[PDB]
Every structure is written in structure tokens, then in C-alpha cells.
Design a protein around this ligand. Structure first.
Ligand SMILES: *[C@@H]1O[C@H](CO)[C@@H](O[C@@H]2O[C@H](CO)[C@@H](O)[C@H](O)[C@H]2NC(C)=O)[C@H](O)[C@H]1NC(C)=O
Ligand SMILES: *[C@@H]1O[C@H](CO)[C@@H](O[C@@H]2O[C@H](CO)[C@@H](O)[C@H](O)[C@H]2NC(C)=O)[C@H](O)[C@H]1NC(C)=O
Ligand SMILES: CC(C)CCC[C@@H](C)[C@H]1CC[C@H]2[C@@H]3CC=C4C[C@@H](O)CC[C@]4(C)[C@H]3CC[C@]12C
Ligand SMILES: *[C@@H]1O[C@H](CO)[C@@H](O)[C@H](O)[C@H]1NC(C)=O
Ligand SMILES: *[C@@H]1O[C@H](CO)[C@@H](O)[C@H](O)[C@H]1NC(C)=O
Ligand SMILES: [Ca+2]
Lengths: 196, 455, 49
């Protein structure tokens, strides 16, 4: 298909979403086992788990709405996920994960893909201190906050070093966009709330 | 004297020029597939060998100083000899000078317009500045003509082996995707096959002017047909081994995008120093133009004896022994050619007129060998090679006009017949008033340009 | 947070941020001085000064 597209004079760009993987990914199966360097590919933390009910490290919520931490039986720790529990978030603060996302960008550009569309980019980094958010309704009981819209998201979206990760993806795509007529396009999806 | 190894080294360097850098785009835009456009470089490569072999016959048996003007005088009479002298001064030689200089500005201005095509005003203002500079240097001096020639034929061959070696190494690494499913969209037709033989044969231009080497060949009769049948077939083998080195790197859809084909190649394969291709090709292309301007005064001398062309054109300047009126008239016609047309509309216009006179010559070869002339011929070619060159050229001259008619052919036919009118009203009838328009013209020109008859 | 002022391999910034961590030692111990030296040199980017 990539050959049939280039012969027509067209270009092909594909969706890329580097924030999370599935909990069936090989990286996560090794990480829960604490295997090798994969023990820190994901964001883990200690949490008390007794009688099926877990207290999370903070009040951070998922985007689809519930506690954003989930207990893992093999690791005996909680892993972070912005979206549903089937999507653990990669840990982009250690340099091992960024070299993996750098080889996937290189794998698809070698096949002739003409560029990418990066999704869920504001969720790349989170605050390291893991402090609780500020509720929208301050006089609300802290055990009924279960909706993503009931919090101010200052520690889970658009953190400080987030733009230097996206600028690093652009440099990896510059090694392939040097020959004239084969520039690699990079586009991102916009923040729904802000235009600045 | 020059041996057989040097007997080919002159002819192979003569054939390979700036045609291999401009024609691939044009032969592929008519074959539409990698497979057939590879057999065109062989089919026209063989057709150029039988041409140069037939020209070896006339070059030995006639044995006159004129290039090809004698061969039409000896066979058909004085009207085709004059009609060729007319066209080779207004059509064949000026337009071949305009295509070489139009193809030198496609390679100088292609890097500065990366990703897209340059405007037409840039590739004509730069071509008009090359024609005037090439024709001015070759008029002020002769040493500077041959000063930079041996270096300009080095850069020509340095690139030819760089493209080939790179296109072979990449073929070992398995980059076979382009010619895997060849012939799939081949548009073979008398329309396309003819128009694609024009552009393929233009890369072989220079096989007719190959007879001068016999004078210094060690054993001409025994070695020249050998130096030809192993020299040119060595070059067609170096073209399909260079056109293959294009399709190994880029695809059939990206070829037609750029006019400078070798510039698209140097960016993809030679990234650290990719400026080497537009720099070296600009050297060789301006060197091949230097070879055209040198021979401009050649044919007008031999045709100036028989009173066919004006004798003032053969006059030489005294301060510098350079055919100044021949050159500045040879370039002034080229300037009028780069203005209306572009490379593709001139390769058709050139290879049309050039190929009817290429036919009339080798038909005169058999016609003289069949009935009229019984003189001895030192080297003899079999009878089946000339009948092929004429039956091929009669297809090349007549199929494009009927199947793919264009306005370029009309202006070509109107030029020769205009010379046919100049035959009767100026040289055939010799009117009285016709003289008094010539005599005051020549010496005033001599007065203004301080030129002198050669001998 | 201090090492961000060194810049990135493609965006240039301060030539170096001033290391004031030696100016903080109030007691001359061997491991107090050794901790400042290795904390700056391992956290620093690759080709920096
Ligand atoms: C968080 O997850 C719980 C499940 O543990 C959700 O609660 C269930 O929601 C569905 C809605 O279709 C109900 O049918 C179930 O009865 C609920 N379960 C219980 C035990 O009440 C809860 O809605 C989620 N929070 C969200 C989506 O904000
Ligand atoms: C924010 O939520 C609080 C509840 O946590 C609202 O305060 C009152 O809460 C009591 C709880 O027993 C209710 O009985 C009252 O009806 C609530 N007052 C209302 C609804 O006016 C508080 O009003 C909420 N504020 C906003 C802006 O929604
Ligand atoms: C007269 C000629 C041989 C002079 C030039 C010599 C040097 C500069 C040439 C000769 C053959 C060339 C190589 C041919 C093929 C390749 C493979 C390609 O993927 C990268 C460039 C590379 C590796 C070329 C580098 C330059 C090279 C080594
Ligand atoms: C994790 O450890 C268990 C226990 O030995 C083993 O059965 C399983 O295969 C391991 N999985 C991975 C992905 O290492
Ligand atoms: C144990 O589980 C039961 C489930 O009904 C729950 O009510 C109880 O609070 C749990 N106890 C602890 C200490 O978690
Ligand atoms: Ca994340």
C-alpha cells in the first residue's frame, strides 16, 4: 500500500500515540515481573490493598473517570494510567523509554511513511511529587470525587518538560527529511480547552 | 601514432555527453515502464553503431576534407549537398548548441530550487548567458578552447563511473523493488516508440563526426571498424548500466518530476557531498558545448568553395586566427532558439531534420555502391546493415509527423524549403542584381570585423 | 531543575548555571564535600562544562 500510494503521487501519514501501551505489551509483562531494565518503563508506586479496596497514592483521576491508579497482583504495586485500566502510562522521565519511542519513529519512516500525527501529547509527563489536585468545588467530600471534570488538572497535563520531548521527536524525524522532496510532516492534536 | 586502445578511447569519450543526464526523463515519460525504457537504450544504441559503421565506408572511399557535404555531392548531385549545407547552418548545428546550453542551466539552477521546478525565465536567462560566453571565448582565443577540454572530459567520466559504481553497490544490497514487475504499463505505439527514439538517440549524437580519427590511427582499415564495433557497443552498455543505476535508487513516478535526473540521484545517495553532481555535470555539459562551437567554421569552408554558402562566413580574423563571423552567426541563431522552445520541443525539432539527412546519406551509400560508382572501397560493410539504417530512419522521420504532429515539425520543413528557394534565386540562376547585394555586403562585414579569407 | 539551564542538544541556553552548592556547606566533612561533587557531575548533561 505504501508503494501503491507513492506511485500515484500521494503521501501517507499515520497516527502515532506514544503515551501508553496495553497491559498485554511485552514491556509491561516484564515490568510487573521486575525483569531487567523494564522495571521502570512504567510509573509504579506503593499502595495499601486489603479486601479488594485500594487507597491510591493521591486523588488523581482517570480521563474517563475513576481513580487513576490500579493495583497489580504480580508487582504488589499501583500503576498509573490516564485512560482506562487497560492502558498503563509509559514513564517518559527515564531515558530508556525515550530511546524505545525513538526506534519506533525510525521503524516506520524507513518503510516510506511520510509523517505522523501525534495524539494525547499533553498527557506525556506528570508531576513527580504526586501531590493531590485542587477540587473545583472545594467544599466537596474527598471520597465522592470520581469525575474527571471535578478536579483542576495542573499536575497531569502539560508539565514543564513536555515540550522538549515533542521537540526530540522532531529531531528524530529530521534524519529522514533531508533529501529534497521527502520532508516528513509532523502534526499534533490540539488542546480542547485552550488555544494559546 | 595512435593504437587501437587509443582508437576507441577517443570515440567513447566523444559519444558520452550531456544526453545521458537529460534524456532518461524524456524516454521514460513515453515508455511509462522501467522494462521497455531499458530496451530503448539498447535498440537505439545498436542503431547508432550501424550508423557509424556505414559512415566509415563513405569516410574511406570518398576521402575528402568535407565532413558529410561531400557524401551528398558524390551521390545525388548538388541540390541535397546544398540543402544539407543550408539546414546544418540554420537547423542542425544551432539547435544542437541550444539544447546543450539549455541542459547546462537545468543542472546549475536545480540545486537552488530544491523540491520544485525552477521558473522558465531562470533557465533561459542562464542559457543565454552560456551561449554568449561560450561563443565569445571561442572567438577571442584558440588556446582557451583546448585549454579546458581535457579537464572537462575528466569530470564527464568521473561522474559516469560514480553513478555506475553506486548504482551497482546498491543493487547488491537488494534494492530491486523498481524493476521487479516491469512491462506492466508499457505504452508501445508508433507514437511513443518514435518519440522515445529521438531522445534516446540524442544521447548518441556525435557518431557521425568520427571519421577524422583515421588520419592518426595506426592501421585505419583494419582497426577503425573494430574501434567502432567495440567502442560504441561499449558505450550503450555503459548507458543501460547507468539508466539502471537510476531506477535502483528512485521510482518511475519521481523520475518525471525533475528535469535534472542526476541531481535527484546525488541527493539520495551522496548526501555528505551531494553538490558534486550539479558541479561536475555543469563542467561536462559546458565542455561538450565547446566542442560544437569549434567545428562551426569547418563545414562552411568546404561549402564555401562550391559557392553554396556565402564565402564571408569562412573568413578568419587576423589578430586571432578564429572564425569570428562563423561563430557569432552560429550563436546568434541559437539565441533565437532558446526563446520560443524548451529542451523537449528542440530534441524533436533537432532529431527530425538531422535524421532525414542521416538517411539520405546512407542511401547514397548503397545507391553509389549499387549502380553509379564502381571505385574501390577499402573497408566494405555487409549489405544488410545500410538497408536497416535507412528503413529505420525512414520510420524515424515519418512516424512522428503523422502520429504525433506538432508545430515544431512545421517550422523545420519551412526552413529547408526556404533554402530550396535560395537555391534557384541565388546560385542556380545567378541573377545580375543578385551579385550587387553580395559584393558590398562581404567586405563591409570584413571592414567592420577585420576578418580575412583563410588562404 | 538547574540542569535544564544547560539547554538541549539542539536548543542552546545558558553556558552554565552557577553552582552555588559548595557555598552551602556549613561543616567541613569529607562526605559533605564529596556529595556536592558527584551530585553535580553525574546530573550534568554530556558535553557540558
Ligand atoms: C468507576 O467504576 C465503577 C465500577 O467499579 C463505576 O460504577 C458502576 O457504574 C455502572 C454504570 O454503567 C453501574 O451500572 C454500576 O452499578 C456501578 N457500580 C457500582 C458498584 O456502583 C463508576 O461509575 C465509575 N466512575 C465513573 C465512571 O465516573
Ligand atoms: C459544592 O458541594 C457542596 C457539597 O459538598 C455544596 O454544599 C451543600 O452541601 C450539602 C450537603 O449536605 C447539601 O445538602 C446542600 O444542598 C449543598 N448546597 C447547595 C447545593 O447549594 C455546594 O453548594 C457546592 N457548590 C457548588 C458551586 O456546586
Ligand atoms: C573515479 C572514482 C572511483 C573516484 C571517486 C572515488 C570515491 C569518492 C567513490 C567511489 C565509489 C563510491 C561509493 C559507491 C557506493 C556507495 C554506496 C552508497 O550507499 C553510499 C556512498 C558509497 C559508499 C560511495 C562513496 C564514494 C565512493 C567510495
Ligand atoms: C513472570 O514471572 C512468572 C513467575 O516465574 C513467570 O511464570 C512468567 O512467565 C514471567 N513473565 C514474564 C513476562 O517474564
Ligand atoms: C474486608 O472486606 C470486607 C468486605 O465486606 C470489608 O467490609 C472490610 O472493610 C474489609 N476490611 C479491611 C480491613 O479492609
Ligand atoms: Ca503519561
Amino acid at each position: 500500500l505504501v508503494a501503491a500510494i507513492h506511485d500515484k503521487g500521494l503521501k501517507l501519514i499515520i497516527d502515532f500515540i506514544p503515551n501508553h501501551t496495553s497491559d498485554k505489551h511485552a514491556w509491561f509483562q516484564w515490568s510487573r515481573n521486575r525483569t531487567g531494565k523494564y522495571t521502570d518503563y512504567y510509573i509504579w508506586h506503593d499502595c495499601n490493598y486489603e479486601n479488594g479496596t485500594t487507597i491510591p497514592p493521591n486523588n488523581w483521576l482517570s480521563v474517563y473517570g475513576n481513580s487513576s491508579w490500579h493495583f497489580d497482583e504480580v508487582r504488589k504495586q499501583c500503576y498509573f494510567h490516564q485512560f482506562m485500566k487497560e492502558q498503563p502510562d509509559l514513564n517518559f522521565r527515564n531515558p530508556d523509554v525515550q530511546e524505545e519511542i525513538k526506534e519506533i519513529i525510525q521503524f516506520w519512516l524507513s518503510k516510506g511513511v511520510d509523517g505522523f500525527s501525534f495524539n494525547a501529547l499533553q498527557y506525556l509527563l506528570e508531576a513527580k511529587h504526586l501531590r493531590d489536585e485542587a477540587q473545583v468545588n472545594k467544599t466537596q467530600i474527598p471520597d465522592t470525587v470520581t469525575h474527571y471534570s471535578q478536579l483542576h488538572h495542573d499536575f497531569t497535563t502539560t508539565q514543564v518538560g513536555m515540550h522538549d520531548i515533542v521537540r526530540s521527536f522532531r529531531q528524530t524525524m529530521n534524519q529522514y527529511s533531508r533529501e529534497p522532496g521527502r520532508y516528513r510532516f509532523m502534526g499534533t492534536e490540539a488542546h480542547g480547552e485552550s488555544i494559546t | 601514432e595512435l593504437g587501437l586502445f587509443s582508437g576507441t578511447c577517443i570515440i567513447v569519450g566523444t559519444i558520452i555527453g550531456s544526453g545521458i543526464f537529460i534524456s532518461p526523463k524524456s524516454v521514460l515519460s513515453n515508455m511509462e515502464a522501467v522494462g521497455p525504457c531499458l530496451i530503448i537504450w539498447a535498440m537505439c544504441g545498436v542503431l547508432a553503431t550501424l550508423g557509424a559503421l556505414c559512415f566509415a565506408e563513405l569516410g574511406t572511399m570518398i576521402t575528402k576534407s568535407g565532413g558529410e557535404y561531400p557524401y551528398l555531392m558524390e551521390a545525388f548531385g548538388p541540390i541535397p549537398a546544398y540543402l544539407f549545407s543550408w539546414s546544418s547552418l540554420f537547423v542542425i548545428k544551432p539547435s544542437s548548441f541550444a539544447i546543450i546550453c539549455l541542459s547546462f542551466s537545468e543542472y546549475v539552477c536545480a540545486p537552488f530550487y530544491s523540491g520544485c521546478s525552477p521558473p522558465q525565465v531562470v533557465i533561459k536567462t542562464l542559457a543565454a548567458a552560456a551561449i554568449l560566453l561560450i561563443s565569445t571565448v571561442n572567438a577571442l582565443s584558440v588556446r582557451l578552447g583546448s585549454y579546458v577540454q581535457n579537464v572537462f572530459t575528466a569530470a564527464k567520466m568521473v561522474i559516469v563511473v560514480i553513478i555506475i559504481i553506486s548504482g551497482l553497490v546498491l543493487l547488491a544490497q537488494g534494492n530491486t523493488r523498481n524493476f521487479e514487475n516491469s512491462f506492466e504499463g508499457a505504452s508501445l505505439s508508433v507514437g511513443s516508440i518514435s518519440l522515445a527514439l529521438y531522445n534516446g538517440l540524442w544521447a548518441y549524437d556525435g557518431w557521425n563526426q568520427l571519421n577524422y580519427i583515421t588520419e592518426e590511427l595506426r592501421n585505419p582499415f583494419r582497426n577503425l571498424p573494430l574501434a567502432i564495433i567495440i567502442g560504441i557497443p561499449l558505450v550503450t552498455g555503459c548507458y543501460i548500466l547507468m539508466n539502471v543505476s537510476y531506477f535502483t535508487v528512485m521510482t518511475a513516478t519521481e523520475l518525471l518530476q525533475s528535469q535534472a535526473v542526476a541531481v535527484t540521484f546525488g541527493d539520495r545517495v551522496l548526501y555528505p557531498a551531494s553538490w558534486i553532481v550539479p558541479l561536475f555535470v555543469a563542467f561536462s555539459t559546458i565542455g561538450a558545448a565547446n566542442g560544437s562551437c569549434f567545428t562551426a567554421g569547418r563545414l562552411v569552408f568546404v561549402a564555401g568553395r562550391e559557392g553554396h554558402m556565402l564565402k564571408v562566413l569562412s573568413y578568419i580574423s587576423v589578430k586571432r586566427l578564429t572564425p569570428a563571423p562563423a561563430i557569432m552567426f552560429h550563436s546568434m541563431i541559437a539565441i533565437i532558439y532558446i526563446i520560443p522552445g524548451d529542451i523537449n520541443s528542440l530534441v524533436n525539432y533537432f532529431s527530425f531534420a538531422a535524421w532525414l539527412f542521416y538517411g539520405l546519406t546512407i542511401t547514397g551509400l548503397i545507391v553509389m555502391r549499387f549502380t553509379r560508382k564502381e571505385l574501390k572501397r577499402p573497408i566494405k560493410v555487409p549489405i544488410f546493415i545500410p538497408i536497416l539504417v535507412t528503413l529505420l530512419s525512414v520510420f524515424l522521420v515519418l512516424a512522428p509527423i503523422i502520429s504525433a504532429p506538432a508545430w515544431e515539425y512545421l517550422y523545420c520543413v519551412l526552413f529547408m524549403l526556404s533554402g530550396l528557394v535560395f537555391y534557384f534565386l541565388f546560385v542556380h540562376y545567378k541573377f545580375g542584381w543578385a551579385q550587387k547585394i553580395s559584393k558590398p555586403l562581404t567586405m563591409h562585414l570584413q571592414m567592420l570585423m577585420e576578418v580575412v579569407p583563410p588562404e | 531543575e538547574t540542569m535544564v539551564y544547560y539547554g538541549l542538544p539542539f536548543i542552546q541556553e545558558a553556558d552554565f548555571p552557577f553552582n552555588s552548592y559548595l557555598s552551602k556547606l556549613d561543616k567541613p566533612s569529607g562526605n559533605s564535600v564529596s556529595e556536592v561533587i558527584t551530585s553535580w557531575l553525574e546530573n550534568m548533561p554530556e558535553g557540558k562544562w
